[PDB]
Amino acid sequence: WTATSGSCKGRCFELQEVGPPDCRCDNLCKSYSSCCHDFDELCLKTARGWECTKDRCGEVRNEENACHCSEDCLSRGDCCTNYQVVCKGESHWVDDDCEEIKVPECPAGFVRPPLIIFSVDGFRASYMKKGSKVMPNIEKLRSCGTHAPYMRPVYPTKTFPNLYTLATGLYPESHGIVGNSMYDPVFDASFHLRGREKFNHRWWGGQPLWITATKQGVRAGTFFWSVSIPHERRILTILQWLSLPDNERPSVYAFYSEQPDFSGHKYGPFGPEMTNPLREIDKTVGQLMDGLKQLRLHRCVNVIFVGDHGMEDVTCDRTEFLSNYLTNVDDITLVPGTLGRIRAKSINNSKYDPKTIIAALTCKKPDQHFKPYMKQHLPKRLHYANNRRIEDIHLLVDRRWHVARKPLDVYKKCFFQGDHGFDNKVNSMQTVFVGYGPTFKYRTKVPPFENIELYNVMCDLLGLKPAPNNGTHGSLNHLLRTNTFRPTMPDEVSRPNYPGIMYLQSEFDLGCTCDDKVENKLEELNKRLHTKGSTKERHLLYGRPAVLYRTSYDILYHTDFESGYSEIFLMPLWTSYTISKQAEVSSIPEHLTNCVRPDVRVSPGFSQNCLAYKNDKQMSYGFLFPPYLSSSPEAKYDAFLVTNMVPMYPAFKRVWAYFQRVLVKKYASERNGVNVISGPIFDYNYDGLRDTEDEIKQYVEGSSIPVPTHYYSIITSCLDFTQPADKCDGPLSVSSFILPHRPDNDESCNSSEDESKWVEELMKMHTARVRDIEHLTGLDFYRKTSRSYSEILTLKTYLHTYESE
Ligand SMILES: *[C@@H]1O[C@H](CO)[C@@H](O[C@@H]2O[C@H](CO)[C@@H](O[C@@H]3O[C@H](CO[C@H]4O[C@H](CO)[C@@H](O)[C@H](O[C@H]5O[C@H](CO)[C@@H](O)[C@H](O)[C@@H]5O[C@H]5O[C@H](CO)[C@@H](O)[C@H](O)[C@@H]5O)[C@@H]4O)[C@@H](O)[C@H](O[C@H]4O[C@H](CO)[C@@H](O)[C@H](O)[C@@H]4O[C@H]4O[C@H](CO)[C@@H](O)[C@H](O)[C@@H]4O)[C@@H]3O)[C@H](O)[C@H]2NC(C)=O)[C@H](O)[C@H]1NC(C)=O
Ligand SMILES: Cc1nonc1CNC(=O)C1CCN(c2cccc3c2C(=O)N(CC2CCCCC2)C3=O)CC1
Ligand SMILES: [Ca+2]
Ligand code: NA
Ligand SMILES: [Zn+2]
């Protein structure tokens, strides 16, 4: 209920929200059907339009006008944005040359540079170049400020999840807005764009920037605008707020444009109809910058121009129908479109089985344009699983396509030529970032980065302490002239033991065998040096990873590799080795095919055993350091140590063997040597975080050998590939993956073929950031380099995407 009988006189676009039932005058009142009766009359004036003309200059003030060109307009703060250009001989901001802003130049009374976030929906990254001829204002911000070639959105590349990610620094699984449409089974409530459930605070997790600001004494403009408020009025309102008295004036503001998304859906990303929407957004940026110039704020305010996601070509005819795959189509609910989420139609259905649904959706048609997954099996880079609103069954839809339940859903509810929502590494989904102002760098290009990082920087720009988020604070310090956050390395929690030879062969009863009984003072001294770490500098190039949780582990040294061996999980947490460009791949000799060797540095009680693998009919084993890359026949025996063994499904061994036998050498050759760190991951509760021992759901049968959910590798080399990985003087280059440890290769529709036709395609889909492996392992990598810590933080956030340009 709302008593619309109050008045907005002197209250237009007030900042505090007045409580029910009293009528509101804030920028969101329309959206709640709650504005005072005279809100339109008083607050949404339109008369004479938005621009001053020659003949209005000096006019007597008429308060019915949308904006003013009277002599008193600057003092009142309500001039049309082009007032000083038209009436006082000034230039538009876009016509002034770019001049470095070395220090904030702010009027008296301004305690910090304000932040203005100008967000644009559906603004695909390639617009910045392809539309640059019709967006002069945006091009000036881009070229003169700090810009990325693109910014990576979160998955799904939908509007609500991305905007709230920008505002919170959180993955959708964590902030709760995991799609534009959701069902929450605990609430038993549905969230959708159209309706009022979406206004309930219970959906909205984390702590968005405007709340972080307010709790810490930094006043915020109200970030949300009812859709009918025209852009010119949003810009005028922001400018009015900026002329408020110091005590009353916000320091952070948001503007939002529904374009170019709105037109992109109708016309496709590059339809001829798209030029006008881009001109219009640019015009709006020009109005804002001119208005800041009038207020003497254009060299004081930090402006962020940022998008939520891109736009792809998508038409009705490119739709896959679940009715062509499932018999039981009426027993499911599909959330459709550029992603699919499936759940049972009724919880009283006893005959609902996800496994049958998945199988009926797996590799059924040759050109199939979607792939089903249990959500825990999605690529971990997506971070799209740990929320009760994400359905167990997910369909990753190919770019350019839709999935729907039945054909009648697509003509009873073409027209649209664009859509978004696909995998966030897809080029067409990439979006924009530009920062301009005293706190940002001048004429600086920075590499692509992920939108989850921005909340930290916005907090940095305002002097705020960020709420806990998924950003890596400091990884974007290279965007800033000042206000950087100087993080320190986390402290190591567990120190390693350095075991020497402590056990005789006969103390072990592992049921393993190896044909290794054949055997100086010469190299016998050398093999002793090797076991004490004499070659460690070659194979551990950036220091030992630090263990950031309490545990018991041993550093083990070898000629060709070093490892951190966990006595709790009975396998290495990490195994580190360097392969030079000149390295030679060799076979496993016939007499060593099944060789496993007890490690005389590690007790029988903390070792795996071969008997468990023999008796577990589903589970085989693999090695972390690959025997195929031994430096010599004698060193090869180290690779068969029981302490280098890890459990692997035969199906997964196909992938792992091809990576180790073929791809590592390929990478060393292409990158001029590589350093590889490999290890297991345990994430049975799919929360992106290292599992404790009591969360492990599966062991090698009859034993305490835990089965990893994933195996990772971090592959580092010199960015300047004219230097070898092991003698690099400058920045590093990295690529990593988190491969799911699955008992089949159903994920790969061509897996019956030779590994050369499908394994690398799988690894690419499962590319990861080092930071992702850190969360999943409780390890901290790159502890000892010659590089600045922030550069290293950036490296750890890097994702190698394998997309074209
Ligand atoms: C990305 O960054 C984010 C933010 O840093 C990381 O998320 C954090 O991870 C922590 C570990 O998982 C987690 O810490 C827990 O907090 C619990 C209380 O949390 C509430 O209060 C906070 C603070 O304001 C609030 O933010 C939380 O918000 C969640 O839930 C609300 C609804 O209540 C949602 O609106 C919101 O979106 C959010 O949901 C998200 O997180 C929850 C988990 O909290 C998920 O379930 C959702 O799907 C969604 O992802 C909460 O309101 C606290 O109770 C926990 O402590 C338990 O465990 C410890 C273990 O030592 C133990 O000491 C305690 O006893 C306790 O166990 C007891 O409860 C158990 C469960 O019922 C029970 O099994 C036991 O037997 C015990 O009874 C814990 O401290 C933190 O909440 C989140 N923060 C956020 C914002 O999500 C995230 O990890 C990062 N991602 C990556 C990959 O790095
Ligand atoms: C019905 C209704 N209620 O309010 N307004 C309307 C009508 N308008 C819309 O529907 C717009 C499109 C969705 N939209 C969202 C959606 C979900 C989360 C956020 C936003 C948003 O703008 N910000 C601010 C960040 C923008 C990006 C920069 C950081 C802050 C979020 O956090 C902005 C409003
Ligand atoms: Ca976990
Ligand atoms: Na297959
Ligand atoms: Zn859209």
Q: Report the b/e string of 262-297 with b at 16+ CB within 10 A.
A: ebbbebbbbeeebbebbebbbbbbbbbbbbbbbbeb
Which residue, 452, 426, 454, is CA-closest to 124? 426
Shortest-distance atom of ligand 1 to CA 203: 35
Measured distance CA(236)–CA(46) in Å, rounded = 12
Sign of the torsion formed by the C-alpha atoms of 278, 284, 289 and 293: positive
- SS3 for 257-310 is EEEEHHHHHHHCCCCHHHHHHHHHHHHHHHHHHHHHHHCCCCCCCEEEEEECCC
The CA distance from 57 to 68, in Å, is: 9
Q: How far is CA 173 from CA 155, 176, 449, 495, 690, in A?
A: 10, 6, 20, 33, 17
Nearest CA to 726 among 773, 675, 687?
Answer: 675
Say which ligand is closest to the CA of 161.
Answer: 2
Q: Indicate the resolution in Å.
A: 2.0
Distance 681 CA to ligand 3 centre (A): 9
The Cβ of residue 201 has, within 10 Å, a number of other Cβ atoms equal to: 6
Radius of gyration of the chain (CA): 30
How many alpha carbons fall within 13 Å on the CB side of residue 430? 21
Is the CB–ligand 2 distance for residue 224 below 6 Å?
yes
163 lines ligand 2 (CB under 6 A): yes
Q: CB of 120 closer than 6 A to ligand 2?
A: no
With a 6 Å cutoff on the Cβ, whether 455 touches ligand 2 is no
CA distance linking residue 798 with residue 771, whole number of Å: 8
81, 146, 159, 212: which one is catalytic? 159
Tokens for 385, please give them: 């699983």
Q: Which two tokens stand for residue 263?
A: 């037109």
Tell me the CA–centroid distance for residue 176 and ligand 2, in Å: 15
Ligand 2 atom, smallest distance to 168 CA: 32
Positive or negative: CA dihedral 635, 636, 642, 647: positive
What is the spatial distance between Cα 483 and Cα 497, in angstroms, rounded to a whole number? Answer: 41
174, 390, 391, 686, best to mutate for ligand 1 pocket (most atoms within 8 Å of CB): 174
Ligand 2 lined by 256 (C-beta under 6 Å)? yes
* Helix (H) or strand (E) segment spanning residue 525: helix 522-531
From 64, 88, 62, select the one nearest 74 (Cα to Cα). Answer: 88
The closest alpha carbon to 375, from 360, 354, 348, 403, belongs to 354
For the annotated binding site for Zn(2+), the residues are: 121, 159, 261, 265, 308-309, 420
For residue 778, report the distance from its CA to the centre of ligand 3, in Å: 11
Expt. technique = X-ray
Q: Could you give the 3-state DSSP secondary structure of residue 91?
A: coil
In this structure, which residue's CA is closest to atom 26 in ligand 1? Answer: 206
Q: Whose CA is nearest to atom 30 of ligand 1?
A: 205
Our answer on whether the CB atom of 164 is closer than 6 Å to any ligand 2 atom is yes
Known binding-site positions for 1-tetradecanoyl-sn-glycerol 3-phosphate? 159, 180, 261, 420
46 assigned to active site = no
Going from the Cα of 491 to the center of ligand 3, the distance in angstroms, rounded, reads: 22
Q: Is 710 in the pocket of ligand 1 (CB under 6 A)?
A: no
Q: Report whether residue 223 contacts ligand 2, using a CB cutoff of 6 Å.
A: yes
- Angle CA(136)–CA(142)–CA(148) in degrees, nearest 5? 145
Residues flanking ion ligand 3, Cβ below 5 Å: 683, 685, 687, 689, 691
Nearest CA-CA partner of 437 in 102, 143, 148: 102
Binding-site positions read 121, 159, 180, 261, 265, 308-309, 420, 683, 685, 687, 689, 691
